């Protein structure tokens, strides 16, 4: 039975991790604190790598991660679980000021850009997906994340799944990945670093979490339509993200660790994910456990109202997945 009310004594829930989830978590925290002023909630954008690492070491109560735990993670830190809180998405942004269209790209073309074989933006491999679009002769500058990052995980899973014989063989996927050292490639800290680094040099391309899409658009960055496995090219919106998640709704396992990248739905956006709370089985005392249960349960019910999720372009957990999340939350004890 999940606690839906926190303790009434003073409790601090410390969070850090995913910058994709941070803007949403910085709305949740204050709203829950307003209803329960004894519960102090601190948050911070540091990357899904730091979120997993700090939740496992116990320096925070909640690690935020766009990546589920590996079997190697779960074998290193038992008690640790990944609790789905919401459904997010990732876009590919690019800095081509003379280009008004939403360029179509797919995993094989993007893999060749991050591998350095496609070096110029009017390469026929890009232009062929965009007939009737005038592309410049601008050098491609592929940006990757410098910190351990859930966004890296999702983007490299999309490259691996759509290019299994190439990118899937090497360098594969992970929260950290050895990106090919193509001339000019740069690394940035956080989604914020990817936005500003992309916006700084024309020709940049970057993988960026959908909670930064508004900022990316404000800075003049283009937003790609990505190809799915059915051959269709899509922007991430409420409906394309929903369509992608819907087939995985019944396949989500009890521990909720599942990749929803590159689904078979023909209208599905190919880079979607669960936003996870990385938390341990055991908290320091009865009050913290109850209170952590109540915040997490609030986050997947009140915190999933469109009034929250629409601000960051997230989609709510489907009803069967909320059940799975509550199942994991209810195990948090002391």
């Amino acid at each position, epitope marked *: 039975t999940v606690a839906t009310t926190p303790a009434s004594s003073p409790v601090t829930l410390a969070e850090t991790g995913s910058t994709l989830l941070y803007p949403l978590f910085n709305l949740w925290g204050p709203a829950f604190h307003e209803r329960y002023p004894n519960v102090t909630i601190t948050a911070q954008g540091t990357g899904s790598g730091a979120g997993i690492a700090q939740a496992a070491a116990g320096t925070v109560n909640i690690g935020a991660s766009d990546a589920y735990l590996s079997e190697g993670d779960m074998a290193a830190h038992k008690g640790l679980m990944n609790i789905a809180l919401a459904i997010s998405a990732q876009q590919v942004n690019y800095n081509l000021p003379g280009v008004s269209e939403h360029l179509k790209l797919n995993g094989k073309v993007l893999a060749a850009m991050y591998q350095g074989t496609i*070096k110029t933006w009017d390469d026929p*491999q890009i232009a062929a997906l965009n007939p009737g679009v005038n592309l410049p002769g601008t050098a491609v500058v592929p940006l990757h994340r410098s910190d351990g990052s859930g966004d890296t995980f999702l983007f490299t899973q999309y490259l691996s799944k759509q290019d299994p014989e190439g990118w899937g063989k090497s360098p594969g996927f992970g929260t950290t990945v050895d990106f090919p050292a193509v001339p000019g490639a740069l690394g940035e800290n956080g989604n914020g670093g990817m936005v500003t680094g992309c916006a700084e040099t024309p020709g940049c391309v970057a993988y960026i979490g959908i909670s930064f899409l508004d900022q990316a658009s404000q800075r003049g960055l283009g937003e790609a339509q990505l190809g799915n496995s059915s051959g269709n090219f899509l922007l991430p919106d409420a409906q394309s993200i929903q369509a992608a998640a819907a087939g995985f709704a019944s396949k989500t396992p009890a521990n909720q660790a599942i990749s929803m990248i590159d689904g078979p739905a023909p209208d599905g956006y190919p880079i979607i994910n669960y936003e996870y709370a990385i938390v341990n089985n055991r908290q320091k005392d009865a009050a913290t456990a109850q209170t952590l249960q109540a915040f997490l349960h609030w986050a997947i019910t009140d915190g999933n109202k469109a009034s929250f999720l629409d601000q960051v372009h997230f989609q709510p957990l489907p009803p069967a997945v909320v059940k799975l999340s509550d199942a994991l939350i209810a195990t948090i004890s002391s």
Partner: antibody, heavy 128, light 111 residues
Framework: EVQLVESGGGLVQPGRSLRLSCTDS????????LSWVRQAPGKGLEWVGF??????????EYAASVKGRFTISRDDSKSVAYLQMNSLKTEDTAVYFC???????????????????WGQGTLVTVSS | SALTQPRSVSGSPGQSVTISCTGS?????????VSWYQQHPGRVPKLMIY???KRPSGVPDRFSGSRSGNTASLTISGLQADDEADYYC???????????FGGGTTLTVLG
């Protein structure tokens, strides 16, 4: 799968026009972008232009040296392409080849990546 | 003319010769669409190398393509009599110029 034969070459006066035709006896003509490449006697290869497949809009591109004078058209119903040559100058004297590509990067209809298939060529002489 | 090749190249039977093809970041060094054609006198060109280093089916392994920077090179090993031909390099050159060719190289076998 591609067997190209040009026709229409011969003698034309400077300033006048001449239309060449390239036909594919194979069954994949609509599947690839059709190119013209020319070669003046004793000299090197020079790309003239190409026309994309209809899946990519059937649009054309031309070398700077012939843009505005040359037009490429295609008629898929007859597996034939055309090179229309206006305001011909003596420096346009050349053997004209039509060339086709095999499938590459699932987009040989948008850009003829390489010239796998060549016609035998047809000699155009611009002279008074 | 748009890519520069040496006008003439020569080697002895059984040896190697390399034909260079220097372009720019706008063509040879800007994409991976470098190709090489062989043309015997009075015959149509024949594709020998594509994607910088790949050989069409039929073409023997003694024809090797490589590239360093803005310069691609064709290498012909174990030279035979029938290698005497012209050789042309070619490359995509962006969405304005599209296709460029080298001026062509005449190969002489020495013996």
């Amino acid at each position: 799968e591609v067997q190209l034969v040009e026709s229409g070459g011969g003698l034309v006066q400077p300033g006048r026009s001449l239309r060449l035709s390239c036909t594919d006896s194979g069954f994949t003509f609509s599947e690839y972008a059709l190119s013209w490449v020319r070669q003046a006697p004793g000299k090197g290869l020079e790309w003239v232009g190409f026309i994309r497949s209809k899946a990519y809009g059937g649009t054309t591109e031309y070398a700077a040296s012939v843009k505005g004078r040359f037009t490429i058209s295609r008629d898929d119903s007859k597996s034939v392409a055309y090179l229309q040559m206006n305001s011909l100058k003596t420096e346009d004297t050349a053997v004209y080849f039509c060339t086709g590509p095999r499938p590459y990067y699932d987009s040989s209809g948008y850009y003829p990546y390489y010239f796998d298939y060549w016609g035998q060529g047809t000699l155009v002489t611009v002279s008074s | 003319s748009a890519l520069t090749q040496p006008r003439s190249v020569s080697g002895s039977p059984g040896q190697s010769v390399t034909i260079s093809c220097t372009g720019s970041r706008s063509d040879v060094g800007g994409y991976d669409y470098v190709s090489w054609y062989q043309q015997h006198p009075g015959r149509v060109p024949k594709l020998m190398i594509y994607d910088v280093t790949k050989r069409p089916s039929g073409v023997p392994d003694r024809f090797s393509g490589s590239r360093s920077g803005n310069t691609a090179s064709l290498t012909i090993s174990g030279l035979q009599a029938d290698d005497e031909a012209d050789y042309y390099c070619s490359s995509f050159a962006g969405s304005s110029t599209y296709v460029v060719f080298g001026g062509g190289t005449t190969l002489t076998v020495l013996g």
